[PDB]
């Protein structure tokens, strides 16, 4: 829709500082420093790599839009998320106690707040028992 393209252009201009039609490492760094979290240049370079396909060293509008058009279902993302959940699956059956996620999922890496983890629980834990089954949850997210 044209509204989505207008949103894309507006925010691409917002990120753009000098106005060269592309988003550089410093632009992402400063905008997400305003976001509170200070990155490392390696992370910004990683973003430059994963968006850009021509190796321009920045993020251009066409690649931005193409990455925008790719939703979770069209990402071939099932294997990665399943494996990530499995590595955290101590029993190996496929059930994880919500308390386990609260203790670990909010205590490691990009730690999340209580609201986010509880929303994860009420989303994946349809039965509301605490034995979250990651396979069905990730499959229905990727639907």
């Amino acid at each position: 829709t044209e509204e989505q393209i207008a949103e894309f252009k507006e925010a691409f201009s917002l990120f753009d500082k000098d106005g060269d039609g592309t988003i550089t490492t410093k632009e992402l760094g400063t905008v997400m420093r305003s976001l509170g979290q200070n990155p490392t240049e390696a992370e910004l370079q990683d973003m430059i790599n994963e968006v850009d396909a021509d190796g321009n060293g920045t993020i251009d509008f066409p690649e931005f839009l193409t990455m925008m058009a790719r939703k979770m279902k069209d990402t071939d993302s099932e294997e990665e998320i399943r494996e990530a959940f499995r590595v955290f699956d101590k029993d190996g059956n496929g059930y994880i106690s919500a308390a386990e996620l609260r203790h670990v999922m909010t205590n490691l890496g990009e730690k999340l707040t209580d609201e986010e983890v509880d929303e994860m629980i009420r989303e994946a834990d349809i039965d509301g028992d605490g034995q979250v089954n990651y396979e069905e949850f990730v499959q229905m997210m990727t639907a």
């Binding site: 989505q4 207008a6 949103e7 894309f8 507006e10 925010a11 691409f12 917002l14 990120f15 905008v31 997400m32 305003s34 976001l35 509170g36 979290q37 992370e43 990683d46 973003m47 994963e50 968006v51 931005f64 990455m67 925008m68 790719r70 979770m72 993302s77 990665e80 998320i81 494996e83 990530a84 959940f85 590595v87 955290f88 029993d91 190996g92 059956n93 496929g94 059930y95 670990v104 999922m105 490691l108 890496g109 990009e110 999340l112 707040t113 609201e115 986010e116 929303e119 994860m120 989303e123 089954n133 396979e135 069905e136 990730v138 997210m141």
Partner: protein
């Protein structure tokens, strides 16, 4: 007892599908039983011990059909425990697994051969062949994963060049030595009537089997046999040594790497990034409120989505390079990064102290 039932079902599933520890004992017993049956089948071939072996074999066949049926039903229940196969349809889906269908086919064949023997029309040879083949089939089924074949293939491919060198040099040595000994003996020795006999002798010698039916009996034949065997035996023994050393080195490297562990950080990042990227919803009361929180920390919508996917993508890559960490890669990359970082900070110290002097 919901808790008790779930615990027992999980315990049986672990024993029957993921025998980490003491559970292997049970499997061993089953193997033993199957193996015992196989041995009895061999004794059934001999005509001297036909009666006692046949009786014990029939008793053991009844016992093993009973045990296999019980195990198959309990395994169906256990797979029922697993969420992937919850419900009747899930259990049926599990039962379509190639090894499960092979096992049920073997069970049906065993009960069928027993029933046919009860009828008496089936010839004894047919029943014996059937039961022997079913026994070997369950023996193969014991693996249930192809782990042994995969490991052997991995180690063989790792040393493909060395193994091919061994095979090639040993083959050339075998051909040359067999031909030379054939020339030396030929008519003098009845054993080496034809070059095919010489090749058979060479193969049986270099492999060190040494049956004794074929052996040189002439001075020149024995001299050449000595000179060539002294190296051919080693060449033919090479592959076993190469594979054994490769297996030991692989075991050492695994006992180091898999004992490293200290992982799940990229997996946790992947979980977080997938959660946030799903959260990029159509302004509903779900995590997209948390997305408004995230954007608060700072048209803009797209950037939010962009960054989320980006973490997702980067997280993916991290886990992908963290799935099977390599000690040498980890150490070299960390050393490079750390030393370069310290050097850069030191140069920052030099610049800052220079300006302080200026101040």
């Amino acid at each position: 007892r919901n808790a008790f039932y779930r615990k027992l079902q999980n315990f049986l599933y672990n024993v029957l599908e993921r025998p980490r520890g003491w559970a292997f004992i049970y499997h061993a017993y089953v193997f033993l039983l199957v193996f015992s049956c196989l041995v009895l089948s061999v004794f059934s071939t001999i005509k001297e011990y036909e009666k006692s072996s046949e009786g014990a074999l029939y008793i053991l066949e009844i016992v093993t059909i009973v045990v296999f049926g019980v195990e198959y039903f309990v395994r169906i229940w256990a797979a029922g425990c697993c969420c992937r196969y919850r419900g009747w349809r899930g259990r049926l889906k599990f039962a379509r697994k190639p090894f499960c269908v092979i096992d049920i086919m073997v069970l049906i064949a065993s009960i069928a051969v027993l029933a046919a023997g009860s009828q008496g029309n089936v010839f004894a040879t047919s029943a014996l062949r059937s039961l022997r083949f079913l026994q070997i089939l369950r023996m193969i089924r014991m693996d249930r994963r192809g782990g042994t074949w995969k490991l052997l293939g991995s180690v063989v491919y790792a040393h493909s060049k060395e193994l091919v060198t061994a095979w090639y040099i040993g083959f050339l040595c075998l051909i040359l030595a067999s031909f030379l000994v054939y020339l030396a003996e030929k008519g003098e020795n009845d054993h080496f009537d034809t070059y095919a006999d010489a090749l058979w002798w060479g193969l049986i010698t270099l492999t060190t089997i040494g049956y004794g039916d074929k052996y040189p009996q002439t001075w020149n034949g024995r001299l050449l046999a000595a000179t060539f065997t002294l190296i051919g035996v080693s060449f033919f023994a090479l592959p076993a040594g190469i594979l054994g050393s490769g297996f030991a080195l692989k075991v050492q490297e695994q006992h180091r790497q898999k004992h490293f562990e200290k992982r799940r950080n990229p997996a946790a990042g992947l979980i977080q990034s997938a959660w946030r990227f799903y959260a990029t919803n159509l302004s509903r009361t779900d995590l997209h409120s948390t997305w408004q929180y995230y954007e608060r920390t700072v048209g803009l919508k797209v950037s939010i989505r962009a960054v989320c996917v980006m973490r997702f993508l980067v997280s993916k890559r991290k886990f992908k390079e963290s799935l099977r960490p390599y000690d040498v890669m980890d150490v070299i990359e960390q050393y490079s990064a750390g030393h370069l970082d310290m050097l850069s900070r030191i140069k920052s110290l030099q610049s800052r102290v220079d300006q302080i002097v200026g101040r």
